[PDB]
């Protein structure tokens, strides 16, 4: 879960979210399409770092 | 919009943008009090922006109105994206004028080969991110059902149809969702989903507005 690539998914919305980046070892922003994708997908950076 | 061009300044008076902290989806003004968008663009709180061309630059024509009712289609499926359509009721009526106006609901289904106009402030790159400040347009044909099912085996529902180019290069993209597909003066489509943007053999998939015309009418009457 904490090692999935940031996936925007098939939907075409633009929603600011966070994922854990294993290379940088910290959470980073990405744009999520609003559906599908994977669980490496958080609303806030703090919550991301909380889980990952 | 990938592979499109900049819309003429006052040309799409029915194009809207959905806004929370920022622009995240499009929509279409269909009456002075109601907007059509996608169910997956649903948020609990939405400000609607009308009369926009450059979302970063106050030009003088804009109306900012908060949603007072946001209504996903009752049968919207979050896993299959079936019935991906949504109504927003504006909290005050929009003022109808040269720069803010209604697009007609369809009186018939879309026919393959018809050239349509797709618009939005969506990403302009198939790889990478380049979000525009100015409204983009794309002229694109409705594809046959066979074409649509062949590109997305086991994924095309009765509420979905495809517009675009099998050869790729031109498509709607992220931040375009909920925006209009307009054919011969009628709103035929709502930007929904796709595999990538403008990828070879992965045309954009859109909600078939014509299938919700009765639902739209009844919902508007139920909430007046
Ligand atoms: Ca503006």
Cα distance between residue A33 and residue A14, in whole Å: 5
User: Which residues are paired to B141 by β-bridges?
Assistant: B115
Let me know: does B76 contact B83? Beta carbons within 8 Å. Answer: yes
**Site of tokens 């019935």:** B83
**CATH number, domain at A22?**
4.10.410.10
Q: Are residues B171 and B185 in the same domain?
A: yes
Let me know: does B205 contact B161? Beta carbons within 8 Å. Answer: yes
Q: Are residues B57 and B120 in the same domain?
A: no
DSSP annotation of B23 reads E
Question: Strand B23-31 and strand A26-32: pairing?
Answer: unpaired
Let me know: does B41 contact B177? Beta carbons within 8 Å. Answer: yes
| Residues of A in Cβ contact (< 8 Å) with B178 | 13
Q: Are residues B205 and B124 in the same domain?
A: yes
Rounded-to-5 percentages of helix, strand, coil across chain B: 10, 35, 55
| Residues of B in Cβ contact (< 8 Å) with A11 | 38, 40, 81, 177, 192-193
Residue A4 is part of which domain span?
A: 1-52
Let me know: does B205 contact B38? Beta carbons within 8 Å. Answer: no
Cα→Cα distances A27→A14, A40, B86, B164, B206, Å: 19, 10, 33, 36, 33
Nearest to B104 by CA among B179, B1, B187: B187
DSSP annotation of B40 reads G
Q: Are residues B127 and B177 in the same domain?
A: yes
**Site of tokens 């949504």:** B86
Q: Are residues B55 and B137 in the same domain?
A: no
E strand segments, chain A: 15-21, 26-32
**CATH number, domain at B50?**
2.40.10.10
Cα distance between residue B90 and residue B33, in whole Å: 5
User: How many Cβ atoms are within 10 Å of B105's Cβ, its own excluded?
Assistant: 18
Please state the domain count of chain A: 1
CA-based nearest distance A50→chain B, Å? 24
Cα distance between residue B82 and residue B220, in whole Å: 21
Q: Are residues B6 and B111 in the same domain?
A: yes
Cα distance between residue B207 and residue A50, in whole Å: 38
The residues on A that touch B, with CB distances below 8 Å, are 8, 10-16, 31, 33-35
Q: Are residues B84 and B187 in the same domain?
A: no
Q: Are residues B58 and B80 in the same domain?
A: yes
Please state the domain count of chain B: 2
Q: Do B81 and A13 touch (CB under 8 A)?
A: no
Let me know: does A2 contact A51? Beta carbons within 8 Å. Answer: yes
The vertex-B173 CA angle with B128 and B49, nearest 5°, equals 115
B191/A contact by beta carbon, under 8 A? yes
Question: Which two tokens mark B67?
Answer: 């949603």
Nearest to B188 by CA among B218, B211, B165: B211
Instruction: Check residue B139 and give left, alpha or beta (phi > 0: left; psi -120 to 50: alpha).
Output: beta
Q: Are residues B139 and B56 in the same domain?
A: no
What contacts A27, CB < 8 A, 6 or more positions away? Answer: A18, A19, A20, A21, A42, A45, A48, A49, A52
Residue B141 is part of which domain span?
A: 1-12+103-210
Q: Do A14 and B78 touch (CB under 8 A)?
A: no
Q: Are residues B30 and B3 in the same domain?
A: no
Nearest to B17 by CA among B45, B43, B37: B37
Helix (H, G, I), strand (E, B) or coil at B63: strand
Q: Are residues B43 and B88 in the same domain?
A: yes
End-to-end CA distance of chain A: 8
User: How many Cβ atoms are within 10 Å of A45's Cβ, its own excluded?
Assistant: 16
Q: Are residues B26 and B117 in the same domain?
A: no
What contacts B127, CB < 8 A, 6 or more positions away? Answer: none
Cα distance between residue B9 and residue B25, in whole Å: 20
What contacts B105, CB < 8 A, 6 or more positions away? Answer: B30, B186, B187, B209, B213, B216
């Amino acid at each position: 879960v904490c090692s999935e690539q940031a996936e925007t998914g098939p939907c075409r919305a633009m929603i600011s979210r966070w994922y854990f980046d294993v290379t940088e070892g910290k959470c980073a922003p990405f744009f999520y399409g609003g559906c599908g994708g994977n669980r490496n997908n958080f609303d806030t950076e703090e919550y991301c770092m909380a889980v990952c | 919009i990938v592979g499109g061009y900049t819309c003429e300044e006052n040309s799409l008076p029915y194009q809207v943008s959905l806004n929370s902290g920022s622009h995240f989806c499009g929509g279409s003004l269909i009456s002075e009090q109601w907007v059509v968008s996608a169910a997956h663009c649903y948020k609990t709180r939405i400000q609607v922006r009308l009369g926009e061309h450059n979302i970063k630059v106050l030009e003088g024509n804009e109306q900012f109105i908060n949603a007072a009712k946001i209504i996903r289609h009752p049968k919207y499926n979050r896993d299959t994206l079936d019935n991906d359509i949504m109504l927003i009721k504006l909290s005050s009526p929009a003022v109808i004028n040269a720069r803010v106006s209604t697009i007609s609901l369809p009186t018939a289904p879309p026919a393959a080969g018809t050239e349509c106009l797709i618009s939005g402030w969506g990403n302009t790159l198939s790889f990478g991110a380049d979000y525009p400040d100015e409204l983009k347009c794309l002229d694109a044909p409705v594809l046959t059902q066979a074409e649509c099912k062949a590109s997305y085996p086991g994924k095309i529902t009765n509420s979905m149809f495809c517009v675009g180019f099998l050869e790729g290069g031109k498509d709607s993209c992220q931040r375009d969702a909920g925006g209009p597909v307009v054919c011969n003066g009628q709103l035929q489509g709502v930007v929904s989903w796709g595999h990538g943007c403008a990828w070879k053999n992965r045309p954009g998939v859109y909600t078939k507005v014509y299938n919700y015309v009765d639902w739209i009418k009844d919902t508007i009457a139920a909430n007046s």
